[PDB]
Write a protein that holds these residues in place. Structure first.
Motif, PDB file in Angstrom:
ATOM      1  N   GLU A 187       8.024   9.162   6.089  1.00  0.00           N
ATOM      2  CA  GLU A 187       7.706  10.040   7.211  1.00  0.00           C
ATOM      3  C   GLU A 187       8.609   9.759   8.403  1.00  0.00           C
ATOM      4  OE1 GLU A 187       3.631  11.190   8.786  1.00  0.00           O
ATOM      5  OE2 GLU A 187       3.054  10.241   6.891  1.00  0.00           O
ATOM      6  N   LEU A 188       8.698   8.491   8.808  1.00  0.00           N
ATOM      7  CA  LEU A 188       9.520   8.137   9.960  1.00  0.00           C
ATOM      8  C   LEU A 188      11.005   8.306   9.663  1.00  0.00           C
ATOM      9  CD1 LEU A 188      10.855   4.886  10.082  1.00  0.00           C
ATOM     10  CD2 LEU A 188       8.473   4.483   9.534  1.00  0.00           C
ATOM     11  N   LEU A 189      11.429   8.037   8.425  1.00  0.00           N
ATOM     12  CA  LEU A 189      12.820   8.275   8.058  1.00  0.00           C
ATOM     13  C   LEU A 189      13.183   9.746   8.205  1.00  0.00           C
ATOM     14  CD1 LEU A 189      15.548   7.490   6.683  1.00  0.00           C
ATOM     15  CD2 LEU A 189      14.428   8.074   4.538  1.00  0.00           C
ATOM     16  N   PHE A 190      12.312  10.640   7.737  1.00  0.00           N
ATOM     17  CA  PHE A 190      12.593  12.064   7.870  1.00  0.00           C
ATOM     18  C   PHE A 190      12.500  12.517   9.323  1.00  0.00           C
ATOM     19  CE2 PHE A 190      12.501  16.499   6.324  1.00  0.00           C
ATOM     20  CZ  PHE A 190      13.450  16.383   5.329  1.00  0.00           C
ATOM     21  N   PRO A 246       0.823  -1.215   0.000  1.00  0.00           N
ATOM     22  CA  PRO A 246       0.000   0.000   0.000  1.00  0.00           C
ATOM     23  C   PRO A 246       0.853   1.259   0.000  1.00  0.00           C
ATOM     24  CG  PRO A 246      -0.883  -1.603   1.538  1.00  0.00           C
ATOM     25  CD  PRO A 246       0.430  -2.149   1.068  1.00  0.00           C
ATOM     26  N   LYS A 247       0.313   2.311  -0.620  1.00  0.00           N
ATOM     27  CA  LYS A 247       1.049   3.564  -0.734  1.00  0.00           C
ATOM     28  C   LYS A 247       1.303   4.180   0.635  1.00  0.00           C
ATOM     29  CE  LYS A 247      -1.038   6.910  -0.541  1.00  0.00           C
ATOM     30  NZ  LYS A 247      -2.314   7.649  -0.726  1.00  0.00           N
ATOM     31  N   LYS A 248       0.342   4.037   1.552  1.00  0.00           N
ATOM     32  CA  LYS A 248       0.517   4.560   2.901  1.00  0.00           C
ATOM     33  C   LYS A 248       1.729   3.948   3.586  1.00  0.00           C
ATOM     34  CE  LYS A 248      -3.377   1.529   3.329  1.00  0.00           C
ATOM     35  NZ  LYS A 248      -4.832   1.488   3.625  1.00  0.00           N
ATOM     36  N   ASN A 249       2.073   2.704   3.247  1.00  0.00           N
ATOM     37  CA  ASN A 249       3.251   2.074   3.834  1.00  0.00           C
ATOM     38  C   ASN A 249       4.521   2.836   3.475  1.00  0.00           C
ATOM     39  OD1 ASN A 249       1.275   0.231   4.508  1.00  0.00           O
ATOM     40  ND2 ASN A 249       2.518  -1.567   3.996  1.00  0.00           N
ATOM     41  N   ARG A 250       4.733   3.092   2.181  1.00  0.00           N
ATOM     42  CA  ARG A 250       5.920   3.832   1.762  1.00  0.00           C
ATOM     43  C   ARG A 250       5.875   5.274   2.254  1.00  0.00           C
ATOM     44  NH1 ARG A 250       7.756   3.789  -4.542  1.00  0.00           N
ATOM     45  NH2 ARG A 250       8.523   1.707  -3.981  1.00  0.00           N
ATOM     46  N   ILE A 251       4.684   5.873   2.280  1.00  0.00           N
ATOM     47  CA  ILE A 251       4.553   7.246   2.760  1.00  0.00           C
ATOM     48  C   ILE A 251       4.974   7.336   4.223  1.00  0.00           C
ATOM     49  CG2 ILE A 251       2.793   8.884   3.517  1.00  0.00           C
ATOM     50  CD1 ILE A 251       1.636   8.947   0.839  1.00  0.00           C
ATOM     51  N   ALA A 252       4.500   6.398   5.048  1.00  0.00           N
ATOM     52  CA  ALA A 252       4.871   6.385   6.456  1.00  0.00           C
ATOM     53  C   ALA A 252       6.339   6.028   6.647  1.00  0.00           C
ATOM     54  CB  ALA A 252       3.980   5.409   7.224  1.00  0.00           C
ATOM     55  N   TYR A 297      10.270  15.384  -3.258  1.00  0.00           N
ATOM     56  CA  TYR A 297       9.345  14.355  -3.719  1.00  0.00           C
ATOM     57  C   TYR A 297       8.156  14.213  -2.777  1.00  0.00           C
ATOM     58  CZ  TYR A 297       7.466   9.678  -4.522  1.00  0.00           C
ATOM     59  OH  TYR A 297       6.629   8.607  -4.729  1.00  0.00           O
ATOM     60  N   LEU A 298       8.401  14.241  -1.469  1.00  0.00           N
ATOM     61  CA  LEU A 298       7.332  14.136  -0.486  1.00  0.00           C
ATOM     62  C   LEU A 298       6.616  15.460  -0.257  1.00  0.00           C
ATOM     63  CD1 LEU A 298       6.158  11.802   1.028  1.00  0.00           C
ATOM     64  CD2 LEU A 298       7.690  12.267   2.944  1.00  0.00           C
TER      65      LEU A 298
END
Lengths: 101, 97, 126, 74, 69, 55, 160
Positions: free
Chosen positions: B13-16, B4-10, B82-83
């Motif tokens: 998010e946590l990486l940043f 899911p896209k939310k997985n990569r988005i999160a 990108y984000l």
RNA sequence: CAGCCACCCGAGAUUGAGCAAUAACAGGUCUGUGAUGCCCUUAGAUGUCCGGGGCUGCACGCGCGCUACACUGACUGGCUCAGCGUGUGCCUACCCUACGCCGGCAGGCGCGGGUAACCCGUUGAACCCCAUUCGUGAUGGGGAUCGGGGAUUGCAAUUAUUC
RNA sequence: AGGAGUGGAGCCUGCGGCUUAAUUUGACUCAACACGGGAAACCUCACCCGGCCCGGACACGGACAGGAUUGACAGAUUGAUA
């Protein structure tokens, strides 16, 4: 209450014994009824293993040995004095804890 | 990589929010260690970071069944652009002095 | 002749008794499996063997039943089916018989070719 | 060892083929004395599904994806 | 003397549920010949009994030279 | 059906989930004291861990 | 949270090994020499020794904080209880790890392997060590591999 | 002389191991390596996925032990005593053992004793000081080969591997 | 000098010949053959089959914004609950 114990667990005898002597001298300096260094039986863990990575040659077993030692000291004192005497620049590599009855 | 896209988005998010990150090696696991209760299986996590490293923006670092992430200024700019991240968030360790 | 019966109790008479009292005549290991409790891995295979029995033409053996895991016996509902059990490359044909009660179906499956008796080799005399 | 040669049957099997309408017209339709989109598909009564969920009304059964209810017509 | 059935060897008998005792020649060996019943079921135990091998998983790779001269 | 597709056997007796933590390997594993390392890495790290031959 | 003393001791040794492995894989380019651990009541600090302190620091002091967060996130300890210092060795001559890495990075950069070994031997002997040996083994000239030695001073190989 | 052999004394008049040099072996390990080079790779795969699939398959000999050959002991029990140590879990679910009862057996339920030399446990283990047989044996030892009954972690124990 | 007593005589992981899809091998005196810390159903499994994601990021061409997997009971069936 007047029931305070201190626990020093380590691996080397020299550093642990120096710390115990320092603590007992410091607690003797102030007029404290302090129980001497109680020496819990040292526990040695024995690990006989293969020396060669791949089984080949002769059966040479490395008897790796780790001995660990424990000292317990009881003393009847205000706990603030216990905290003030704990931070006496203790030796690195020794684990010191405070236990209540 | 079908996740899911939310997985990569999160993940981004946590990486940043932490600047650095790590990847654990296991398939017997149910999900990710810090992503528990989030139903984020670690398999898709290692898929994610291997894709990120293969893209040529994070230098690989491995030790003892664990992967260590790096942070590059080019990578920071690329991730922010990108984000669409606001240009005021900084790596976590720079906060609190 | 003298009609064989399972410990004095036959298929209809096995049906008459409840399974819990049927365990006494049964053997262990196929007694613990019920005693602890039963779970999945016996739903779709039993369904398809019942269907192979149902869709069978009259007075003919039912359609082939395909399995990999060697099943066991806990109630004779599966009895009367012909099963191809996977051995690793092929399917072994076994037709269930009313003398097999109280025994595993894994004893009626094979995984290896029977050995050969030939001649001694070169390096075997010392 | 040799090549395992998993080629005894099925000379070349591929992925599943799915063909979709450019813009689905089988979902809503006219001819119900209504000027709005007229409902021919069954509405799911379950809360966890909804009116955007179209249980495919094939020749048999209802196919949902989450609950998969079945209605018989006979 | 109401000795329980499990102490006996013929507990949970074949054919019929039997728990009494009968010691006599000419029938005890037929009870010993209980492999024929399983022989007719051609189980793995049946085949192993056919070849005269230890069916309890004993290794018979090359050992077992006694009884063959 | 993904639950039935993967890991249809709960392993409360497995050892690969807690295999050697230096390199992904199981052969020559010790499970004592939670070390979870192979013999090679155990002997390559025993001095760093705190084990030392004395007898 | 707590476990018996033997298991905690072996776990702390394991953590030390993990830390040293990650650091020697990371900062060996910066003349990394060694690591050490200090433990205070409910606090743990890890100190490092490396020849090039300015290079091991980096720019803005970013690497130290980044790596510290890495280890804090790796080992699951309570956050904010780990801090990593910046110390230089007493000398690079009497440290075997530092000279081994110096020889390593003289070898990678392109140089006659025996010239590098001779240079490291001279550097050791002007450092004041009582003796040393260095062995470089592998394919130097040809396809065969010959282990190659250099010794100076005196070295003991037996006893305590 | 370096030492050796006896005696007084002394706890000990040679306790036992660990480490262990030059220089080497085309010894083993590319099946520890996320240490790996160069050919084989680059999906008709050279993996975790059903574990479905096997060294628990057999016409003889070499190769590391125990039972055994008994009146040097199997044998009823009367018993008085160990040492080394792993042991209820920041993804580590797997822990050693007492009260009451049941059942020959695998175990059961209430709190369970275990951050330790406190819990196992004054570790009530092997032989023997005795108590029916054997009083000189192929058997009761050799139960090594085939029947049947149970439980505790096992999605599955069939080729009963487990008691 | 001999002492447990060796191979002796049933039953060992183990090796060697072992068809079959593979009984796999690596390691032949001491310096292999209870060795690979190997008592294996599963992680010891490498090897015989059918599926699992391609773990394909640059160049360049497709419906080029709706491209295509998880959608328990029946149907296409070396799984019907992949």
């Amino acid at each position: 209450i007047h029931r305070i114990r201190i626990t020093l667990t380590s691996r080397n005898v020299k550093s642990l014994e120096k710390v115990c002597a320092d603590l007992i001298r410091g607690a003797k300096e102030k007029n404290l009824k302090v129980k001497g260094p109680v020496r819990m039986p040292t526990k040695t863990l024995r690990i006989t293993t293969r020396k060669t990575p791949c089984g080949e040659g002769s059966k040479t077993w490395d008897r790796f040995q780790m001995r660990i030692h424990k000292r317990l000291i009881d003393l009847h004192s205000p706990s603030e004095i216990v905290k003030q005497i704990t931070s006496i620049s203790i030796e690195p590599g020794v684990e010191v804890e405070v236990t209540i009855a | 990589m079908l996740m899911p896209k939310k997985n990569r988005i999160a993940i981004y998010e946590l990486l940043f929010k932490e600047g650095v990150m790590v990847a654990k090696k296991d398939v017997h696991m149910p999900k990710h260690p810090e992503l528990a209760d989030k139903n984020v299986p670690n398999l898709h996590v290692m898929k994610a970071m291997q894709s990120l490293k293969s893209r040529g923006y994070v230098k690989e670092q491995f030790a003892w069944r664990h992967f260590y992430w790096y942070l590059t200024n080019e990578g920071i700019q690329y991730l922010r652009d990108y984000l669409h991240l606001p240009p005021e968030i900084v790596p976590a360790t720079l906060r609190r002095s | 002749f003298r009609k064989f019966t399972y410990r004095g109790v036959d298929l209809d008479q096995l049906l008459d008794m409840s399974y819990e009292q049927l365990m006494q005549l049964y053997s262990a290991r196929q007694r613990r499996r019920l005693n602890r409790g039963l779970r999945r891995k016996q739903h779709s295979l039993l369904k398809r063997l019942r269907k192979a029995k149902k869709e069978a033409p009259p007075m003919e053996k039912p359609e082939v039943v395909k399995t990999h895991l060697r099943d066991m016996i806990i109630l004779p509902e599966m009895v009367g089916s012909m099963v191809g059990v996977y051995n690793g490359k092929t399917f072994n044909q076994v037709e269930i018989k009313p003398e097999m009660i109280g025994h595993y179906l894994g004893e009626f499956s094979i995984t290896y070719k029977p050995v050969k008796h030939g001649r001694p080799g070169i390096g075997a005399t010392h | 060892k040799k090549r395992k040669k998993k080629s005894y049957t099925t000379p070349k099997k591929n992925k599943h083929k799915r063909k979709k309408v450019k813009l689905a017209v089988l979902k809503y339709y006219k001819v119900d004395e209504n000027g709005k989109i007229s409902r021919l598909r069954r509405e799911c009564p379950s809360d966890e599904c909804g009116a955007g969920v179209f249980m495919a009304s094939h020749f048999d059964r209802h196919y949902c994806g989450k609950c998969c209810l079945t209605y018989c017509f006979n | 003397y109401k000795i329980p059935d499990w102490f006996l060897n013929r507990q949970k008998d074949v054919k019929d549920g039997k728990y009494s005792q009968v010691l006599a020649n000419g029938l005890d060996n037929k009870l010993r010949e209980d492999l024929e019943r399983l022989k007719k079921i051609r189980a793995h135990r049946g085949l192993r009994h056919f070849w005269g091998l230890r069916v309890r998983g004993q290794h018979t790779k090359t050992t077992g030279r006694r009884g063959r001269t | 059906g993904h639950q039935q597709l993967y890991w249809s056997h709960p392993r409360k007796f497995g050892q690969g989930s807690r295999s050697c933590r230096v390199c992904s390997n199981r052969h020559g594993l010790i499970r004592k004291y939670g070390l979870n390392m192979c013999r090679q890495c155990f002997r390559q790290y025993a001095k760093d861990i705190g084990f030392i031959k004395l007898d | 949270v707590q476990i018996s003393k033997k298991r905690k001791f072996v776990a702390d040794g394991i953590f030390k090994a993990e830390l040293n492995e990650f650091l020697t894989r990371e900062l060996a380019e910066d003349g990394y020499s060694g690591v050490e651990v200090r433990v205070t009541p409910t606090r743990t600090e890890i100190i490092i020794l490396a020849t090039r302190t300015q290079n091991v620091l980096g720019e803005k002091g970013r690497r130290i904080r980044e790596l510290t967060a890495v280890v804090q996130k790796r080992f699951g300890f309570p956050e904010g209880s780990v801090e990593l210092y910046a110390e230089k060795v007493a000398t690079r001559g009497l440290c075997a790890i530092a000279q081994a890495e110096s020889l390593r990075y003289k070898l990678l950069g392109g140089l006659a392997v025996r010239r590098a070994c001779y240079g490291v031997l001279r550097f050791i002997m002007e450092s004041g060590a009582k003796g040393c040996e260095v062995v470089v083994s592998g394919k130097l000239r040809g396809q065969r591999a010959k282990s190659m030695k250099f010794v100076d001073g005196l070295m003991i190989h037996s006893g305590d």
